[PDB]
């Protein structure tokens, strides 16, 4: 992909005590045009792993297809081994790096959330093959607008509860709606716990416009 066509905006992720939460708005933008307003940019990879993607949506659909087939192929063996979130993150890092090295990149930034062996995993992979782990993550404009809030909270409180993390991501999504011109007030929250992966569907943030009257 030399030129991304339909793209998704920021994806947020936060670790919490006993799981991980990821948030993404449900919009595919065609340049400035909010063309496709009900697309899911979060995928359940398996019972312990979920994946959210910003960037080119067709590249995301391709990656979702390939990952789904890999997970199916592994589940067929029935040998008691399953891909951990870390293994999926490593595989995605390799795939992105290989495509970048061919000068034919997959134009996506991905947040991989997971919960295995009583430990939370939150990984970042960008289109050049830059990957890492962190307590909190935000792609695109989120990196400038959401990440400071997440990191302030986590710096003063390293371990969050699920409720605390959920409130945090809601606040970040509201800020993104206020300030990201490619945002949309309809988003999904995916949570991975020991219980599995649960994707909560169309949500909206309450907004305040009182400053609109504060005009002179």
């Amino acid at each position: 992909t030399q030129n991304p066509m339909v793209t998704g905006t920021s994806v947020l992720g936060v670790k919490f005590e006993g799981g991980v939460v990821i948030a993404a708005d449900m919009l595919g933008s065609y340049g400035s045009l909010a063309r496709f307003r009900n697309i899911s940019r979060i995928m359940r990879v398996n019972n312990s792993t979920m994946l959210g993607a910003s960037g080119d949506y067709a590249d995301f659909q391709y990656l979702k297809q390939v990952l789904g087939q890999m997970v199916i192929d592994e589940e067929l063996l029935g040998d008691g081994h399953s891909y951990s979130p870390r293994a999926i993150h490593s595989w995605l890092t390799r795939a992105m790096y290989s495509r970048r090295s061919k000068m034919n990149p997959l134009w996506n930034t991905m947040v991989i959330g997971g919960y295995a062996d009583g430990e939370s995993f939150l990984g970042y992979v960008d289109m050049l093959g830059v990957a890492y782990e962190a307590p909190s993550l935000a792609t695109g404009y989120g990196a400038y607008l959401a990440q400071p809030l997440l990191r302030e909270v986590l710096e003063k409180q390293p371990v969050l509860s699920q409720t605390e993390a959920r409130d945090l991501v809601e606040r970040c999504m509201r800020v993104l709606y206020y300030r990201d011109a490619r945002s949309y007030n309809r988003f999904q929250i995916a949570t991975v716990t020991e219980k599995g992966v649960e994707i909560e569907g169309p949500l909206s943030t309450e907004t305040n416009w009182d400053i609109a009257h504060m005009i002179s």
């Binding site: 297809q65 087939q69 199916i72 192929d73 589940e75 067929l76 063996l77 029935g78």
Partner: protein, 241 residues
């Protein structure tokens, strides 16, 4: 007499003896049976245990070739594993190209043609395995197919491959499987496998059970352990009396 050394040579009677020899290899294997019922398909296999040194579950002859498709094999196990890999590749490629689960009939046809391609040349030899494919879907119902070394594929209500296929078929024909559930059919399958098993020649064996149907929501899987224990108890009770 020289006519039976290559699959690319017809005998003067129009037979291909290498394919018949591969079929003999299939015939010298422990039996497997598939039964199609109203709700799905049940597979049973008489896995002969050639030594107590082996871990239980070694050399499984039931495979998952797709979420919705199970496969039971008889004959050369390595050839069977190769064909299972081929079937898995076919299902995965079909999902990649057309975006939905491969219909069982189409998968059976594709794998049967792959098998057939090995019956025409001196460069390769025919596969030495027969196998059944079972699936259940809401739209298609329950489907059971069998493929043999010649590449012939047919749909069945009840199928037996292996060395005791004829006796197993005689037993299967006594069931009215068209109006039965998977829950009773698993017991009947265990009973048939126990009946046809040769206690003297074959020594010990493990019963392998799998199924795919409404009760599994279209997913092929090994029969749960309690279900298998009940089925084996029923089969032994049927044998003893």
């Amino acid at each position: 007499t020289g006519y039976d050394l290559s699959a690319s040579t017809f005998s003067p009677d129009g037979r291909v003896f290498q394919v018949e020899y591969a079929m003999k290899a299939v015939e010298n294997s422990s039996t497997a049976i598939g039964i199609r019922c109203k709700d799905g398909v049940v597979f049973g296999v008489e896995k002969l245990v050639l030594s107590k040194l082996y871990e239980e579950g070694s050399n499984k002859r039931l495979f998952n070739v797709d979420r919705h498709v199970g496969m039971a094999v008889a004959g050369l196990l390595a050839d069977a594993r190769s064909l299972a890999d081929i079937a898995r590749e076919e299902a995965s490629n079909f999902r990649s190209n057309f975006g939905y689960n491969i219909p069982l009939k189409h998968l059976a046809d594709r794998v049967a043609m792959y098998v057939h391609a090995y019956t025409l040349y001196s460069a390769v030899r025919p596969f030495g395995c027969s196998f059944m494919l079972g699936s259940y879907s809401v739209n298609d119902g329950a489907q059971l197919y069998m493929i043999d070394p010649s590449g012939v594929s047919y749909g069945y209500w009840g199928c037996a491959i292996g060395k005791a296929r004829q006796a197993a078929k005689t037993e299967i024909e006594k069931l009215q499987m068209k109006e039965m559930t998977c829950r009773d059919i698993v017991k009947e399958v265990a009973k048939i496998i126990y009946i046809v098993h040769d206690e003297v020649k074959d020594k010990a064996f493990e019963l392998e059970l799998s199924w795919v149907g409404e009760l599994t929501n279209g997913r092929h899987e090994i029969v749960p352990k309690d279900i298998r224990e009940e089925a084996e108890k029923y089969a032994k009770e049927s044998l003893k009396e």
